[PDB]
Amino acid sequence: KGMVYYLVPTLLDEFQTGSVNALSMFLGQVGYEMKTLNADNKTDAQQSQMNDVIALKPAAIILAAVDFNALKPSIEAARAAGIPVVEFDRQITSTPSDFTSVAGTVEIGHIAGDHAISLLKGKNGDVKGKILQVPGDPGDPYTLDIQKGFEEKIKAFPGVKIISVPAVQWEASAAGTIVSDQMLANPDIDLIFLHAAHLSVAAVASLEAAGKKPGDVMLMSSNGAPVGLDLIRKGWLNVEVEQPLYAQAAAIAMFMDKVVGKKPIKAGDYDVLGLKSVVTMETWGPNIKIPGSAITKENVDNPSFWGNLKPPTAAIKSVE
Ligand SMILES: N[C@@H]1[C@@H](O)[C@@H](O)[C@@H](CO)O[C@@H]1O
Numbered sequence: 045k046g047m048v049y050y051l052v053p054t055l056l057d058e059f060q061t062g063s064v065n066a067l068s069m070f071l072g073q074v075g076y077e078m079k080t081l082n083a084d085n086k087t088d089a090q091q092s093q094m095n096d097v098i099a100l101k102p103a104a105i106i107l108a109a110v111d112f113n114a115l116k117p118s119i120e121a122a123r124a125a126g127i128p129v130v131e132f133d134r135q136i137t138s139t140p141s142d143f144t145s146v147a148g149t150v151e152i153g154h155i156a157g158d159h160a161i162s163l164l165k166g167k168n169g170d171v172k173g174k175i176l177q178v179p180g181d182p183g184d185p186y187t188l189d190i191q192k193g194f195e196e197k198i199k200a201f202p203g204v205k206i207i208s209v210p211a212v213q214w215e216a217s218a219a220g221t222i223v224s225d226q227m228l229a230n231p232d233i234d235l236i237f238l239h240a241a242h243l244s245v246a247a248v249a250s251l252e253a254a255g256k257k258p259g260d261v262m263l264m265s266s267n268g269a270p271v272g273l274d275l276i277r278k279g280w281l282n283v284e285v286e287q288p289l290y291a292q293a294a295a296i297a298m299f300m301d302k303v304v305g306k307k308p309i310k311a312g313d314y315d316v317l318g319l320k321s322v323v324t325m326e327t328w329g330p331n332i333k334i335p336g337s338a339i340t341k342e343n344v345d346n347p348s349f350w351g352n353l354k355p356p357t358a359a360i361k362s363v364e
Contacts, residue, residue, distance in 0.1 A: 045075040046103025046304055051093050053110040053134070054085045056214070057242045058269040058351075059289055063132065066290055066355065067106065070297035073359040076103065076304075085213050087114045094118040097127075103304045104128040104142075106296060111183035112136050128303045130296055133287075135185045137328050143303045144331040145295045147287035149186055152266050152336040153193020156237055159283045159338060160198060163262050164234055172203035173234035176226050178219050178247070179210045180239045186287075187214075187239045190266055194237065207233075211243055220246035227254055227261075235262040241272025241284060241351075248280045268339065273351035276344045284339045289350040291316040291334045294360050299332075301362045314363075317356050318348060 048071055055061050068078045081097070083090035087110045097105055098121060105122055107129060109115035116139045122129045128142040135146050164173040177194065180187030191208070198204050207226060211218040219238060223246065227233060238244050244265040251261055258279035265272055268286025275281035295316045302309050309330035314321045316334060323332045339349055347354040 046077075047100075048076050048078045048104045048106060048300070049097045049100070049102050050078055050080045050106045050132075051083065051090055051097065051108065052080055053083050053090065053108050054214070055082050056085070057240065058271065059240070059267055059287070062289055062350070063108070063293055066293035067132070067296065069355070070294045070360050071300060074297050074300055074362045076297070076300055083110050085110060087111050090115065091118055094122065098122055098125055101125075101127065104130055104300065106130045106132050108132045108134045109136060109183075112185050113138075113183070128306070130303060131328075132296060133186060133292060135189070135328070135331075137326070140327070140329045142329055143296065143299055143309060144326070144328060145292045146331070146333055147186070147292060148333050148335050149189035150193035152285050152287060153190040153195075154197060155285045155336065155338050156190070156264060156266050156283070157194045157197025159264060159285075160194075160235055160237060161201065163264075163282055164204060167234055167262070170203060171201040174205040174207070174230060174232050176223070176230070176233050176236045177206060177208040178222055178236065178238040178243055179208060180214045180243070181212060182210055184214070190239055211238070214240065214243075216242050216246040219243040220250050223247045223250035224254065227251070233261060235264065238263075238265045240267040241265045241269035241275070241281075244275055244281060245271050248275060266336075268336070268349060268351045270351045270353060273339070273344050273349070276339065276341055279341075282340070284351070285336050286339055286349055286351065287336045288317070288319055288334045290355055291319045291321065295321060295332045295334060297360050298363050
């Protein structure tokens with residue numbers, strides 16, 4: 045049917061390596077081969093790779109941009125040369141793509157927010173306290189939009205103080221250092237919210253080295269990686285708001301025939317791996333937005349949560 049290239053930004057967590065495996069398999073089910081190129085968090089490498097792939101004229105490119113600004117010209121070059129470009133996970137609103145498959149990021153933030161509020165209230169009686177937020181890389185719209193959705197909720201209660209410190213390049217060691225430094229300066233911190241679970245792995249270790257045990261400082265993160273689900277069962281993590289990795293990948297495969305053949309993608313409500321998903325036509329082109337979900341000890345074992353690594357059995361079917 046055609047070759048698809050995936051320009052993955054890094055392979056430095058379970059969502060990234062997982063996305064490779066999920067895209068390859070689902071694209072295999074609808075008849076496409078896939079090849080993966082890793083930018084390892086270097087914009088230069090990814091732009092070199094775009095051009096390399098442009099020159100290889102595949103049936104489509106799937107991009108998850110290291111930096112959402114820097115790649116805008118690249119995306120345009122591909123489309124100039126009539127190569128379909130699909131944006132995965134990291135939304136690029138500034139220039140048209142042929143398809144976009146993302147989580148509801150602002151909504152994940154909102155969900156994070158609601159729980160931060162119910163937590164704190166649970167601890168402090170009133171909606172008050174202090175939160176440390178550890179967003180991801182500033183070049184990444186996934187964490188940028190989660191930040192908006194989260195702050196929107198918290199700001200509504202000025203009795204909650206927020207301290208936010210980004211983990212540059214999505215690095216857990218940066219998270220680690222932030223948590224130790226912010227904790228020493230603020231022993232009153234009630235909750236840390238980090239925008240992906242591999243960051244919470246560092247937070248836990250930092251909290252441990254300060255003498256803390258599970259539950260002492262509440263913790264939440266927002267991508268659903270396996271390590272997060274581990275930390276939930278261990279009592280370290282109060283909440284993990286997942287993004288639906290498998291659905292986001294499957295959605296790309298479901299629509300690949302429309303994307304490769306340059307056929308239109310119809311707006312509406314779709315089911316993707318059992319998730320109600322919403323396709324709209326945006327200025328950056330067709331866009332499917334798949335909901336995230338709050339996970340706690342109470343539902344951490346649900347097989348629909350990608351962190352349990354139970355991908356749906358059967359197969360994807362191409363949208364007609
Ligand atoms: N949505 C993903 C998130 O799960 C995480 O893999 C991050 C890489 O650390 O990149 C993107 O933000």
